[PDB]
């Protein structure tokens, strides 16, 4: 019957939280109940989905988690479960979810509670005498894991994208395009920039702004970007003011008509630090927009293979990211093979039949 599903926060606009909400569906679908526990809920509660909002308290992050695992626990050892499946590193997970790259592997990069907390739970799943079963998404960093943990190989199972349906380009895409340019005040000779998702510091929200700021005059002028996210705008707006950007520069909060966006910008620019995976690459790939992306994103090889959009070799140089913002845009022949890329690509490719496949290897 009932199926625990653990995260620290619900929201919907999160890559965690919505893989977290196409599994759990899957799983209703397929005749079981859903547990959720967890710090937070927002938004609406699916029908027939039991979310316990823990009580508990901490002024420290990782401290707040520990007396979460034991709340969960003194309720999970009243009410059983059939299955306990994780979205973040804790203990008592018989499954878990790999939406975070290995935490050792960057912490190499240790006295500290936060540091000890971190690496005790991410060990409590990947040591090999836990019995944890591990769903990866990035390939690349199930290697980083046995490096540090020593994991069995049998334990790993490799999930295929998840992109949800809406996000593939409709029949109608000229016209969503057409009337949110509109909206938005996007001519014809326009460029839109946009940087989507939340955690904009790690997602290179500044490394963006410079890129955009340096461009030549004849491209700056036409230019403009579009941030969206959870994200406190005010520590860029104080970048935004001393770049000169305030007039082409929006942060705008979560929205649910991301797809929109998709389609009404000419460039996906992500030139993220560090990203286990990065959805919104793929969700700009299916909807034929040209990315420009930092190698380190564990998705970014699709860009390449596809062709469709560029990726900036490591070490990160913001002369290079700014001098290849600038080829992109100054190439619209180039921007409009690699769009058509994309969608070509989208139409063959298995990015979307993750939650079935996780479903299958949670019961089954
Ligand atoms: O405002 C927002 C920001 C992100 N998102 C979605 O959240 C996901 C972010 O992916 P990530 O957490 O793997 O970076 C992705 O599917 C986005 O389309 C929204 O739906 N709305």
């Given at each position: 019957?009932t199926?625990?599903?653990?995260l620290y926060?619900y929201?919907?606009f999160g ?6 909400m ?11 109940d859903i547990?959720?526990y ?9 029908d027939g989905?039991e979310?316990?909002v ?5 002024i420290?992050?990782?401290?707040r988690?520990?007396?979460f695992?034991?709340?969960?626990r003194a309720?999970?050892?009243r009410?059983?479960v059939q299955?306990?499946?994780?979205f ?5 997970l018989?499954?878990?979810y790999?939406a975070?790259a290995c935490?050792e ?5 240790r006295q500290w509670g936060?540091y000890r ?5 991410e060990?409590?799943?990947?040591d090999p005498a836990?019995k944890?079963?591990i769903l990866?998404i990035?390939?690349v ?6 490096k540090?943990y020593?994991?069995q190989?049998?334990r790993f199972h ?5 992109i949800s349906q809406?996000?593939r ?9 057409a009337?949110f ?5 996007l ?5 839109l920039?946009?940087?989507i ?10 490394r ?8 030549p005059?004849?491209?700056?002028r036409?230019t403009?970007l579009?941030?969206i996210?959870?994200?406190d705008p005010?520590?860029?707006?104080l ?10 520069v929006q ?9 929109r966006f ?10 993220a630090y560090?990203e ?20 380190v ?5 699709y860009?390449?293979e596809?062709?469709a959009?560029?990726?900036?070799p490591?070490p990160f140089?913001?002369?290079?990211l700014?001098?290849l913002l ?13 769009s058509?890329?994309?969608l070509?690509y989208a139409?063959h490719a298995?990015?979307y039949?993750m939650?079935?496949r996780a479903?299958?290897?949670?019961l089954?």
């Open positions: 019957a199926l625990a599903f653990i926060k929201f919907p890559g965690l939280q919505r893989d977290f196409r599994i759990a569906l899957e799983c209703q679908r397929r005749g079981h547990r959720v967890t710090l937070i809920w927002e938004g609406d509660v699916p989905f979310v316990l823990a009580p508990v308290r901490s420290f992050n990782h401290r988690n520990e007396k695992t034991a709340w969960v309720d999970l050892d009410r059983p299955r306990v499946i994780g973040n590193k804790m203990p008592g018989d499954v878990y790999a975070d935490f592997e960057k912490a190499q990069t936060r907390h971190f690496a005790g739970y060990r409590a799943v990947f836990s944890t079963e990866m990035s390939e960093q199930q290697p980083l894991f046995v540090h020593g994991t190989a049998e490799l999930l295929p994208p998840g809406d996000r380009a409709p029949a109608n895409a000229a016209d969503v395009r009337e340019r509109r909206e938005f005040g001519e014809e000779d326009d460029l920039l946009v940087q998702g939340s955690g904009f510091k790690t997602k290179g929200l500044d963006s702004l410079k890129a955009l700021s340096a461009l005059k004849a491209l700056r036409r403009r579009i941030a996210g959870q994200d005010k520590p860029f707006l970048q935004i003011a001393a770049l000169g950007l305030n007039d082409q942060i705008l909060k979560g929205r649910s008509d991301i797809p998709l389609l009404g910008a000419d460039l996906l620019i992500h030139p560090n286990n995976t990065g959805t919104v690459l793929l969700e700009a790939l299916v909807s034929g927009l040209p990315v420009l992306v930092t190698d994103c564990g998705y970014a090889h860009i390449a596809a062709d959009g560029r990726v900036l490591s140089e913001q002369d290079s700014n001098r600038a080829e992109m845009l100054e190439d619209a022949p180039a921007r409009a093979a690699w058509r890329n994309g070509a139409d298995d990015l039949s939650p079935q479903a299958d290897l949670i089954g």
